[PDB]
Amino acid sequence: LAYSPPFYPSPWADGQGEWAEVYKRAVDIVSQMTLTEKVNLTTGTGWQLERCVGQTGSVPRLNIPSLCLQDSPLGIRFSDYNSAFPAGVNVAATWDKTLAYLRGQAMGEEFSDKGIDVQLGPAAGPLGAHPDGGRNWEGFSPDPALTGVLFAETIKGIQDAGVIATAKHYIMNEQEHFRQQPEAAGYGFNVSDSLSSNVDDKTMHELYLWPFADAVRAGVGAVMCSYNQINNSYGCENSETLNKLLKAELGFQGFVMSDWTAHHSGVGAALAGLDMSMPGDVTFDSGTSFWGANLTVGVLNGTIPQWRVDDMAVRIMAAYYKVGRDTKYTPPNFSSWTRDEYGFAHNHVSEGAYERVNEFVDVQRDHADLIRRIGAQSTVLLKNKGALPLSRKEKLVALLGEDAGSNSWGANGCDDRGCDNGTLAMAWGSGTANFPYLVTPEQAIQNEVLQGRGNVFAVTDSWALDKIAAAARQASVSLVFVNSDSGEGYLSVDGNEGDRNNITLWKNGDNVVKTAANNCNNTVVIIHSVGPVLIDEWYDHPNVTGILWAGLPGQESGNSIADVLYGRVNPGAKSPFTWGKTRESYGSPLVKDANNGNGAPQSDFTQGVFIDYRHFDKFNETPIYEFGYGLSYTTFELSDLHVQPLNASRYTPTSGMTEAAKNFGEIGDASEYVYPEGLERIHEFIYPWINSTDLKASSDDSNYGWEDSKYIPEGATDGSAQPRLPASGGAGGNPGLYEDLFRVSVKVKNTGNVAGDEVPQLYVSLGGPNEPKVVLRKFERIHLAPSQEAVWTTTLTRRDLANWDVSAQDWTVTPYPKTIYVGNSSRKLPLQASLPKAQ
Amino acid sequence: LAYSPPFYPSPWADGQGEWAEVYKRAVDIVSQMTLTEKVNLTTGTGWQLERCVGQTGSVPRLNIPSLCLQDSPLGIRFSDYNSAFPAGVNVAATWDKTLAYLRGQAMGEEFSDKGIDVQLGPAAGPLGAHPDGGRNWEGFSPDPALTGVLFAETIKGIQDAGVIATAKHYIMNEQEHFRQQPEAAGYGFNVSDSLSSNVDDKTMHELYLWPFADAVRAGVGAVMCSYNQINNSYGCENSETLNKLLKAELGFQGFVMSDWTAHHSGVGAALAGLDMSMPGDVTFDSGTSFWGANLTVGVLNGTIPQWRVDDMAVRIMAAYYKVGRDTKYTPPNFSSWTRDEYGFAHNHVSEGAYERVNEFVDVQRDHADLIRRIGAQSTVLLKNKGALPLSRKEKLVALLGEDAGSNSWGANGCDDRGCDNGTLAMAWGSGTANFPYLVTPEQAIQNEVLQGRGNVFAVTDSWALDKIAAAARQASVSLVFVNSDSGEGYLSVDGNEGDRNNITLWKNGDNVVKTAANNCNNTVVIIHSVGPVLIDEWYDHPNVTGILWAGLPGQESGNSIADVLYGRVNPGAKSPFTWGKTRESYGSPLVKDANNGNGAPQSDFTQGVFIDYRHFDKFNETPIYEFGYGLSYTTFELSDLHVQPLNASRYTPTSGMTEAAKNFGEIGDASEYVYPEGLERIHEFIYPWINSTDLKASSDDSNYGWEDSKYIPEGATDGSAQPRLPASGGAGGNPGLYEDLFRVSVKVKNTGNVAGDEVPQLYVSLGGPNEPKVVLRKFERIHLAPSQEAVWTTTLTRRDLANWDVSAQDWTVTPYPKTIYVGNSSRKLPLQASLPKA
Ligand SMILES: *[C@@H]1O[C@H](CO)[C@@H](O[C@@H]2O[C@H](CO)[C@@H](O[C@@H]3O[C@H](CO[C@H]4O[C@H](CO[C@H]5O[C@H](CO)[C@@H](O)[C@H](O)[C@@H]5O[C@H]5O[C@H](CO)[C@@H](O)[C@H](O)[C@@H]5O)[C@@H](O)[C@H](O[C@H]5O[C@H](CO)[C@@H](O)[C@H](O)[C@@H]5O[C@H]5O[C@H](CO)[C@@H](O)[C@H](O)[C@@H]5O)[C@@H]4O)[C@@H](O)[C@H](O[C@H]4O[C@H](CO)[C@@H](O)[C@H](O)[C@@H]4O[C@H]4O[C@H](CO)[C@@H](O)[C@H](O)[C@@H]4O[C@H]4O[C@H](CO)[C@@H](O)[C@H](O)[C@@H]4O)[C@@H]3O)[C@H](O)[C@H]2NC(C)=O)[C@H](O)[C@H]1NC(C)=O
Ligand SMILES: *[C@@H]1O[C@H](CO)[C@@H](O[C@@H]2O[C@H](CO)[C@@H](O[C@@H]3O[C@H](CO[C@H]4O[C@H](CO[C@H]5O[C@H](CO)[C@@H](O)[C@H](O)[C@@H]5O[C@H]5O[C@H](CO)[C@@H](O)[C@H](O)[C@@H]5O)[C@@H](O)[C@H](O[C@H]5O[C@H](CO)[C@@H](O)[C@H](O)[C@@H]5O[C@H]5O[C@H](CO)[C@@H](O)[C@H](O)[C@@H]5O)[C@@H]4O)[C@@H](O)[C@H](O[C@H]4O[C@H](CO)[C@@H](O)[C@H](O)[C@@H]4O[C@H]4O[C@H](CO)[C@@H](O)[C@H](O)[C@@H]4O[C@H]4O[C@H](CO)[C@@H](O)[C@H](O)[C@@H]4O)[C@@H]3O)[C@H](O)[C@H]2NC(C)=O)[C@H](O)[C@H]1NC(C)=O
Ligand SMILES: *[C@@H]1O[C@H](CO)[C@@H](O[C@@H]2O[C@H](CO)[C@@H](O[C@@H]3O[C@H](CO[C@H]4O[C@H](CO[C@H]5O[C@H](CO)[C@@H](O)[C@H](O)[C@@H]5O[C@H]5O[C@H](CO)[C@@H](O)[C@H](O)[C@@H]5O)[C@@H](O)[C@H](O)[C@@H]4O)[C@@H](O)[C@H](O)[C@@H]3O)[C@H](O)[C@H]2NC(C)=O)[C@H](O)[C@H]1NC(C)=O
Ligand SMILES: *[C@@H]1O[C@H](CO)[C@@H](O[C@@H]2O[C@H](CO)[C@@H](O[C@@H]3O[C@H](CO)[C@@H](O)[C@H](O)[C@@H]3O)[C@H](O)[C@H]2NC(C)=O)[C@H](O)[C@H]1NC(C)=O
Ligand SMILES: [Cl-]
Ligand SMILES: [Cl-]
Ligand SMILES: [Mg+2]
Ligand SMILES: [Mg+2]
């Protein structure tokens, strides 16, 4: 079995870089706290007991309210009068830093105005090793460079609006199957623990960890550790990933929270680098916690050093201050658990005051315009044989497919969006929000047509192929809408247990396209989907005159696609993943079977860095549509590639020592931390207090009281100055990684008759034997008027040209010659240059 | 068994009234025709053989093209790039002469531009004796006066746009069950003929015939005779209804066509007053006809007098000339049978040229605006507890019910509209058109809300009561859409064989309302339906703050209802029928069982004139919402009723004689009418020519050749001058009926704060025993600004105050005292006056 070696102690915060002032303030206030006040910040109060999906204990003596933590990465979950933004995969499709930032800002505004302190997003894990992975859509792209940039901008936008962002899921949660033992049980498997993702150190650094470095460098306040194991150590107690990679190497100064029921042990997790238990209980509404009283006891009995729990509270408070939450705080003004105006303060048990739990605060502002715009700008034009844009003089339009129409249960009619009924604007699970409304394609396009003389019919039963054919036969243009859905592992839709069982269109989609294309010579296909689908059977049909991929656009879906189809927006999105001929062209099969007996199933990441386009390139598979590809209503030309070497400082591997750990504040006698007698204990609520000064009894852990060496690795309680890792030194790693080595410029010209955007892309060949032919490094979306030329300049950093050396435990720019390729897809790379050796 | 007495001969045209010039011209051209040319005009060419649902033969020698006849009363059937207008029942709900006319004009323009010569509409039969009758919605109202006025205006509009209108279905086709023997067979009944409607002479005159008098007086070109029997004599060979009532009494100068396969015999129909056989064959694609060669033979063998077939051609050509079709003619530029560009000229057999059969001509003009308007103006506000109009600042709107949503097969996805899927904008059968598009309530209201900050959810599964409740709970206002559907007898939807099996909301509708009202304190209910529904289970729920009936609004449905709900239009429609507590409150049960053994089922019209509100009034049944009732966003008051007796000419019962019948043109030897040698005969096509000069063989009728007295009533071939009937004398009867006897005026005032329309109504009590307490006679829709007053002046004619006297066979103003009642519904009649004797 794969083994995750120990890395201890859990590094303590030090106010490095831009965290200096908030670290000082965090220390100042945590120094004033009692042990139980500190424990309160670290532990949620239990599932469904307050307003938000996660809520910490409060520190009322110091005027610190409970931190409210709320899903999702695309909008506020379980609320009202809020917006539903396009999914993260759409943002990836924009290839646009500014739209990622703006979306982050707009989301942060809405979260803030509902009284939410922590947004549980954005996501770069799963990255997207498996195209059928159920949650890839919540993130960005399988490409680490593209994902990292847009992850970071999203984080900056959320945090500039005064809400803590949470980089999730850290790390290697690349599939839903077996992510949780009780879920697997409920699906009829018998396994003793969650799936283990087994991955080598090079691949970890060069692929899966890379976007998390970006998040740390961008100043992200929190990281959410994952449900799965890595090398058979749970995400929320993996000392290698949390202590060594995230904290020691990347220099992360904020706090690690668990995914919901991803916390498995009190002492183990705390020493392995967890900082916050959510939603606080052992299991939902168990009325027990791995922390709470257990964390109080674990400190009181001398096992968990005071400096470790102090560090947790310093990290949490530093983040809270870093986004200015102390100045922006407002109390939650909604409830996650009901839409009623009135209800019990503690919903799961019907206790506390019966009070106004929803104030119905309109937080939407004008964010609808931004959502519409991102929807248009994330629409990838894959094929256009002079079909588009439409004129609005078409004699008859046919709108075809269930994906054009309405969810007859309402936009929010399926809990957690757990269905594929009507237009697919949002995929399923906890990465969801309630729609304030949903504009369907049927609605938007009919409205467009009815401004002129056009006739229009909408056939939204995908199983009525006779009716689809008949409408298609009469039409000047047939607009076919189709979809493929997936989601979080706890929710099964038509037997798809989060992960999608195939990558074929749902709801008879291939047959809708074929029936339409057989009856209409001008058939345009629009795909709403969580990721790539198989299009081999119909994409080159001579009647399929248009193909677009529109992802999961949120509330303005219809309007976003109409804008593109009628030419108000000239599409300029590029594919953020590869469109292959078969499922098998992708490699990386999901682990769908209990492949380790009754033990934890094992998923070995033997593909290494060769996922998505890197796999296709290595195995010489030809994509139908490649990573980075998309069309436009104009044409562009790239020319005049130049490389400017920059006078850069040398890389200095980091050396020396940290400071020794510090205790902040004092801990007294066990008696100080017993429950106050007049406090009415709410049932199932998780408090920091102990029942009595009997510590064994107050914990109730039937294995309580062993000597440390029986169950705690060496060094886990060592508070001395520790060595600095060579690849450490700053936020996101050694600052020498982010030294600029080269400026690379290229001319981009709009050679056609319509204004539009191009996405020029810079790929590098790092050189040497089992390195990918190309990996993406830089890109930009540039708007050009007809005939306009602009020179695009980007930079290559040391890190962009480096490889992870497992022996040095450092990033190294290898002696192999490096070559750059510039173009407008991962396969349309007409320009190139050999780079000189960099300093 | 009820018996229909003989009335013969079939009266011949005489260019009466406004028909004088076109009669002259018709005679002139028919005089030039050979027998087979004449027969060609009288007989369709067979089902699915040419472009239109009906097409006559042509007269190419005289440059007369084939007459193209097309459904429906609400828009062109089986075509493209056309409009779908609101149904006739919506027109009735407007109570607006002008909207009826304008809709007629708009329809006529579209029919004309497709190359259609005859619109198969409008309808006043079924009138609406049975609230569950499947086709009442195609017509106007069970009230004859309201129906007659709006029937007539519709006819005038169609004909002023240059298309022949067809007054249908004549007469007593009050239900779909058993209307046709083969339909009944297909539904598992064994009956030897169609249902017979048995109805007394008084009731016929005072109720069912009345709107047809209006049609005739309005100059209607054609009448379609019905599938049913009247007193056990088929509609298309009933000598009493066609010869005596329509032709002799009402003076009808145009032509009678059969409903499609309603023609039952060659000689019998011709002498009983039929003028045109549609679609021309005995049964669909039989390749035989009751006329065609049989009519040629029936003349050649001396049975059917020449004057009878000449008269048929005169009546047909006179109608064609009356609307100016000779100047407006354009060839049909579409096909009923396919939407493909190219196809065979003769669709059913794939013969003739393979040619362009659809030219896709856009005939819609700007008619969409008129459709949206009529939709708004036909929406009856039944209840409003300060819910309406909406502001567009409502925080969250819930749209609830399948009737709010889309037909997922497309607007035209069910053949002949034979389903109740998504919003109900058009009911089913032949009275249908293809939508150019359909705006759903979901679409229009979401669009409205999205102009502001309102959140909005649409739950359009009427079975997902949990989802309905949840959305309703969150809403500031819940807009519940519900429906009830019906249609023509040939098509069964969910076991409803045209006629609806009950008058309860379809698709779980009562439950949708209740679920919504239990969860939302501001629930507005919008009903789209063919006619009245039962609302007793929720109408007075304290959370039902609004109730509207929007009928069948056609293509702009969503926009029409949004206009009303958001107050761009202040609703002023009144109910054109009664909303009762139970089905039983209406009386008039349908005949749903083979009630006469294996014979023709019998339906006796024992209720007489007492249908709809007249029944309620007689049996002291209290309607939930009465005939003529509707609310508005303002209030009105009526006052100062005055009655002025007028200096009227006396009624003179008509006397004297007609002219004797005339032959127009000559008939030669049988050999002149044999098929021409070189003519390629299209299979199944109905031609006027005979196979040979052997007449018996050319007919092939296995009972051919009896002496007349064995199977033809006395007088049926009598061409002598005939007596004029006392109640005859002009178009729609004796012109003394239309003399004004009283001028009646009343003041109407808008006493509220919004501009709006009121519909003042004048009812009369004709007096005597077994007469209704009140019957509607006059009405008008009047627009008033807040505080504005206007005086409405109308008249009462002799006919308005008369009764049909079975002994005199005449209309008589009886000596019983008459009283008038003025108000704004059939029960809100605060003003009254006894009339002096005229
Ligand atoms: C103060 O106070 C406090 C509070 O109050 C307290 O505390 C307490 O304490 C106690 C003691 O005393 C405890 O208990 C314990 O615990 C433990 C732990 O757990 C956790 O973790 C795990 C893992 O581990 C690992 O890791 C970590 C981190 O993460 C660390 O820490 C450790 O040390 C380790 O390490 C290792 O490895 C790594 C990698 O991975 C590396 O790196 C290093 O170096 C090393 O090597 C896990 O597993 C767990 O989990 C589980 O559980 C949970 C709950 O908690 C859940 O949730 C999950 O799911 C899971 O489950 C599963 O499994 C189980 C079992 O366990 C079952 O049952 C189920 O069913 C399933 O399947 C966690 O998380 C532990 O371990 C322990 O236990 C043990 O013992 C018992 C008794 O007998 C049994 O039963 C079990 O089984 C076990 O066993 C084991 O061991 C033994 C000895 O010890 C042996 O014999 C056996 O064989 C086994 O072994 C195996 O395994 C191991 C591990 O892995 C290895 O090592 C080996 O090799 C083999 O393979 C107990 O339980 C508790 O916890 C606490 N509490 C709290 C609340 O905190 C104290 O005490 C006080 N003090 C005074 C003085 O007073
Ligand atoms: C020239 O040419 C031409 C052409 O080509 C020709 O013609 C022809 O002719 C033939 C003869 O010959 C014919 O046939 C015949 O016909 C008849 C008629 O039919 C129809 O109608 C009916 C009714 O009737 C009624 O009405 C009318 C009017 O509307 C009239 O016209 C008549 O006359 C009558 O009358 C009566 O009544 C009324 C009331 O209603 C009154 O008003 C009066 O006064 C009187 O009384 C009907 O019914 C029919 O119908 C049926 O048919 C159809 C087909 O067509 C169908 O669609 C329907 O549905 C029905 O059916 C049912 O029925 C049947 C039976 O009929 C069966 O089969 C089935 O299944 C079902 O159920 C029509 O519309 C007829 O009638 C005839 O028949 C007869 O006879 C046979 C043999 O014998 C038998 O079978 C039958 O049954 C019958 O019988 C009867 O009658 C007889 C005498 O006539 C007697 O004897 C017996 O007994 C019986 O009786 C009974 O019944 C009746 C009835 O109603 C009564 O009346 C009694 O009383 C009793 O009860 C035959 O068929 C044909 O049509 C023709 N064709 C064409 C194309 O046009 C000619 O011929 C030529 N000419 C030369 C010289 O050559
Ligand atoms: C990849 O992964 C996806 C997702 O898991 C897999 O998709 C799933 O594939 C299975 C297997 O094919 C599907 O189950 C099938 O669903 C069929 C359709 O079910 C729906 O429609 C039924 C019938 O609906 C028609 O008829 C009714 C009444 O007769 C009408 O109301 C309705 O409007 C329809 O009318 C049409 O058809 C009738 C004739 O039947 C005509 O007369 C009409 O004119 C008109 O043309 C209905 O009963 C049912 O309740 C459904 O609503 C079903 O027939 C078949 O037996 C089977 O159950 C899943 O639905 C599908 N799920 C998803 C999410 O797509 C996919 O298979 C997989 N691919 C591969 C290659 O592994
Ligand atoms: C302190 O943390 C410990 C865990 O380290 C908590 O003890 C654990 O509490 C859970 C209840 O949430 C126990 O689960 C129960 O186990 C029985 C055993 O068969 C099972 O039948 C129940 O369905 C349930 O799974 C678990 O056994 C227990 N673990 C041990 C080793 O004692 C404890 O509750 C925490 N204390 C506080 C104050 O929250
Ligand atoms: Cl919710
Ligand atoms: Cl059609
Ligand atoms: Mg191929
Ligand atoms: Mg226990």
PDB file of N, CA, C and O and ligand atoms in Angstrom, chain A residues 461 463-467 494 496 502 506-507, chain B residues 409, ligand 3:
ATOM      1  N   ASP A 461     -39.514  17.993 -25.854  1.00  0.00           N
ATOM      2  CA  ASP A 461     -39.469  16.596 -25.532  1.00  0.00           C
ATOM      3  C   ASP A 461     -38.398  15.868 -26.382  1.00  0.00           C
ATOM      4  O   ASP A 461     -38.608  15.570 -27.543  1.00  0.00           O
ATOM      5  N   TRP A 463     -37.581  12.848 -26.393  1.00  0.00           N
ATOM      6  CA  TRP A 463     -38.045  11.516 -26.781  1.00  0.00           C
ATOM      7  C   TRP A 463     -39.125  11.532 -27.832  1.00  0.00           C
ATOM      8  O   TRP A 463     -39.487  10.484 -28.315  1.00  0.00           O
ATOM      9  N   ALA A 464     -39.599  12.707 -28.246  1.00  0.00           N
ATOM     10  CA  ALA A 464     -40.573  12.802 -29.306  1.00  0.00           C
ATOM     11  C   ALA A 464     -39.876  13.102 -30.653  1.00  0.00           C
ATOM     12  O   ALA A 464     -40.031  14.215 -31.249  1.00  0.00           O
ATOM     13  N   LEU A 465     -39.118  12.125 -31.133  1.00  0.00           N
ATOM     14  CA  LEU A 465     -38.320  12.316 -32.360  1.00  0.00           C
ATOM     15  C   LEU A 465     -39.152  12.598 -33.596  1.00  0.00           C
ATOM     16  O   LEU A 465     -38.761  13.406 -34.460  1.00  0.00           O
ATOM     17  N   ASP A 466     -40.368  12.053 -33.661  1.00  0.00           N
ATOM     18  CA  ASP A 466     -41.291  12.426 -34.712  1.00  0.00           C
ATOM     19  C   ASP A 466     -41.592  13.954 -34.730  1.00  0.00           C
ATOM     20  O   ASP A 466     -41.653  14.591 -35.806  1.00  0.00           O
ATOM     21  N   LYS A 467     -41.797  14.531 -33.547  1.00  0.00           N
ATOM     22  CA  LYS A 467     -42.146  15.973 -33.425  1.00  0.00           C
ATOM     23  C   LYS A 467     -40.907  16.833 -33.703  1.00  0.00           C
ATOM     24  O   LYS A 467     -40.992  17.836 -34.398  1.00  0.00           O
ATOM     25  N   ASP A 494     -30.240   9.271 -11.920  1.00  0.00           N
ATOM     26  CA  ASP A 494     -30.345   8.177 -12.895  1.00  0.00           C
ATOM     27  C   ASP A 494     -29.179   7.225 -12.806  1.00  0.00           C
ATOM     28  O   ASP A 494     -28.591   6.857 -13.812  1.00  0.00           O
ATOM     29  N   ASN A 496     -26.204   7.843 -11.787  1.00  0.00           N
ATOM     30  CA  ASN A 496     -24.894   8.482 -11.819  1.00  0.00           C
ATOM     31  C   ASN A 496     -24.591   8.992 -10.425  1.00  0.00           C
ATOM     32  O   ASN A 496     -25.203   9.949  -9.959  1.00  0.00           O
ATOM     33  N   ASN A 502     -21.152   7.772 -18.203  1.00  0.00           N
ATOM     34  CA  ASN A 502     -20.551   7.945 -19.516  1.00  0.00           C
ATOM     35  C   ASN A 502     -20.329   9.428 -19.841  1.00  0.00           C
ATOM     36  O   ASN A 502     -20.734  10.290 -19.040  1.00  0.00           O
ATOM     37  N   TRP A 506     -26.927  13.341 -22.471  1.00  0.00           N
ATOM     38  CA  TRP A 506     -28.054  12.791 -21.733  1.00  0.00           C
ATOM     39  C   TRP A 506     -29.327  13.021 -22.494  1.00  0.00           C
ATOM     40  O   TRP A 506     -29.366  13.712 -23.498  1.00  0.00           O
ATOM     41  N   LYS A 507     -30.397  12.414 -22.025  1.00  0.00           N
ATOM     42  CA  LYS A 507     -31.775  12.669 -22.527  1.00  0.00           C
ATOM     43  C   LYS A 507     -31.871  12.549 -24.050  1.00  0.00           C
ATOM     44  O   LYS A 507     -32.311  13.462 -24.738  1.00  0.00           O
TER      45      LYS A 507
ATOM     46  N   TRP B 409     -44.170  19.335 -27.433  1.00  0.00           N
ATOM     47  CA  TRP B 409     -44.142  18.829 -28.816  1.00  0.00           C
ATOM     48  C   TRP B 409     -44.159  19.979 -29.835  1.00  0.00           C
ATOM     49  O   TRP B 409     -44.221  19.724 -31.024  1.00  0.00           O
TER      50      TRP B 409
HETATM   51  C1  LIG C   3     -25.298   7.478 -20.502  1.00  0.00           C
HETATM   52  O1  LIG C   3     -25.857   7.960 -19.290  1.00  0.00           O
HETATM   53  C2  LIG C   3     -27.181   8.492 -19.453  1.00  0.00           C
HETATM   54  C3  LIG C   3     -27.609   9.072 -18.122  1.00  0.00           C
HETATM   55  O2  LIG C   3     -27.632   8.066 -17.113  1.00  0.00           O
HETATM   56  C4  LIG C   3     -28.115   7.393 -19.945  1.00  0.00           C
HETATM   57  O3  LIG C   3     -29.408   7.959 -20.151  1.00  0.00           O
HETATM   58  C5  LIG C   3     -30.572   7.213 -19.838  1.00  0.00           C
HETATM   59  O4  LIG C   3     -30.795   6.180 -20.777  1.00  0.00           O
HETATM   60  C6  LIG C   3     -31.905   5.355 -20.417  1.00  0.00           C
HETATM   61  C7  LIG C   3     -31.937   4.203 -21.382  1.00  0.00           C
HETATM   62  O5  LIG C   3     -32.188   4.664 -22.704  1.00  0.00           O
HETATM   63  C8  LIG C   3     -33.181   6.189 -20.440  1.00  0.00           C
HETATM   64  O6  LIG C   3     -34.291   5.373 -20.076  1.00  0.00           O
HETATM   65  C9  LIG C   3     -35.164   5.288 -21.199  1.00  0.00           C
HETATM   66  O7  LIG C   3     -36.058   6.403 -21.277  1.00  0.00           O
HETATM   67  C10 LIG C   3     -36.990   6.305 -22.371  1.00  0.00           C
HETATM   68  C11 LIG C   3     -37.779   7.594 -22.421  1.00  0.00           C
HETATM   69  O8  LIG C   3     -38.439   7.831 -21.187  1.00  0.00           O
HETATM   70  C12 LIG C   3     -39.259   9.002 -21.236  1.00  0.00           C
HETATM   71  O9  LIG C   3     -40.279   8.945 -22.242  1.00  0.00           O
HETATM   72  C13 LIG C   3     -41.177   7.824 -22.103  1.00  0.00           C
HETATM   73  C14 LIG C   3     -42.136   7.851 -23.288  1.00  0.00           C
HETATM   74  O10 LIG C   3     -42.441   9.193 -23.687  1.00  0.00           O
HETATM   75  C15 LIG C   3     -43.269   9.244 -24.890  1.00  0.00           C
HETATM   76  O11 LIG C   3     -44.590   8.710 -24.754  1.00  0.00           O
HETATM   77  C16 LIG C   3     -45.420   9.385 -23.778  1.00  0.00           C
HETATM   78  C17 LIG C   3     -46.742   8.642 -23.749  1.00  0.00           C
HETATM   79  O12 LIG C   3     -46.747   7.564 -24.685  1.00  0.00           O
HETATM   80  C18 LIG C   3     -45.574  10.858 -24.162  1.00  0.00           C
HETATM   81  O13 LIG C   3     -46.286  11.549 -23.137  1.00  0.00           O
HETATM   82  C19 LIG C   3     -44.210  11.504 -24.365  1.00  0.00           C
HETATM   83  O14 LIG C   3     -44.384  12.840 -24.831  1.00  0.00           O
HETATM   84  C20 LIG C   3     -43.374  10.696 -25.352  1.00  0.00           C
HETATM   85  O15 LIG C   3     -43.946  10.746 -26.656  1.00  0.00           O
HETATM   86  C21 LIG C   3     -43.198  10.210 -27.797  1.00  0.00           C
HETATM   87  O16 LIG C   3     -43.184   8.786 -27.964  1.00  0.00           O
HETATM   88  C22 LIG C   3     -44.478   8.181 -28.221  1.00  0.00           C
HETATM   89  C23 LIG C   3     -44.237   6.689 -28.344  1.00  0.00           C
HETATM   90  O17 LIG C   3     -43.738   6.155 -27.120  1.00  0.00           O
HETATM   91  C24 LIG C   3     -45.091   8.791 -29.482  1.00  0.00           C
HETATM   92  O18 LIG C   3     -46.392   8.243 -29.694  1.00  0.00           O
HETATM   93  C25 LIG C   3     -45.162  10.306 -29.347  1.00  0.00           C
HETATM   94  O19 LIG C   3     -45.674  10.896 -30.542  1.00  0.00           O
HETATM   95  C26 LIG C   3     -43.785  10.874 -29.042  1.00  0.00           C
HETATM   96  O20 LIG C   3     -42.918  10.689 -30.156  1.00  0.00           O
HETATM   97  C27 LIG C   3     -41.891   7.909 -20.754  1.00  0.00           C
HETATM   98  O21 LIG C   3     -42.760   6.790 -20.592  1.00  0.00           O
HETATM   99  C28 LIG C   3     -40.866   7.947 -19.626  1.00  0.00           C
HETATM  100  O22 LIG C   3     -41.515   8.109 -18.366  1.00  0.00           O
HETATM  101  C29 LIG C   3     -39.875   9.085 -19.839  1.00  0.00           C
HETATM  102  O23 LIG C   3     -40.523  10.338 -19.642  1.00  0.00           O
HETATM  103  C30 LIG C   3     -37.872   5.075 -22.178  1.00  0.00           C
HETATM  104  O24 LIG C   3     -38.782   4.977 -23.271  1.00  0.00           O
HETATM  105  C31 LIG C   3     -37.006   3.826 -22.076  1.00  0.00           C
HETATM  106  O25 LIG C   3     -37.810   2.679 -21.794  1.00  0.00           O
HETATM  107  C32 LIG C   3     -35.951   3.994 -20.986  1.00  0.00           C
HETATM  108  O26 LIG C   3     -36.535   4.024 -19.686  1.00  0.00           O
HETATM  109  C33 LIG C   3     -33.057   7.357 -19.473  1.00  0.00           C
HETATM  110  O27 LIG C   3     -34.196   8.206 -19.566  1.00  0.00           O
HETATM  111  C34 LIG C   3     -31.786   8.159 -19.743  1.00  0.00           C
HETATM  112  N1  LIG C   3     -31.599   9.191 -18.751  1.00  0.00           N
HETATM  113  C35 LIG C   3     -30.937  10.317 -19.055  1.00  0.00           C
HETATM  114  C36 LIG C   3     -30.595  11.239 -17.918  1.00  0.00           C
HETATM  115  O28 LIG C   3     -30.656  10.609 -20.208  1.00  0.00           O
HETATM  116  C37 LIG C   3     -27.600   6.799 -21.249  1.00  0.00           C
HETATM  117  O29 LIG C   3     -28.385   5.675 -21.631  1.00  0.00           O
HETATM  118  C38 LIG C   3     -26.141   6.360 -21.138  1.00  0.00           C
HETATM  119  N2  LIG C   3     -25.634   6.010 -22.444  1.00  0.00           N
HETATM  120  C39 LIG C   3     -24.930   4.898 -22.701  1.00  0.00           C
HETATM  121  C40 LIG C   3     -24.648   4.634 -24.146  1.00  0.00           C
HETATM  122  O30 LIG C   3     -24.500   4.178 -21.809  1.00  0.00           O
END
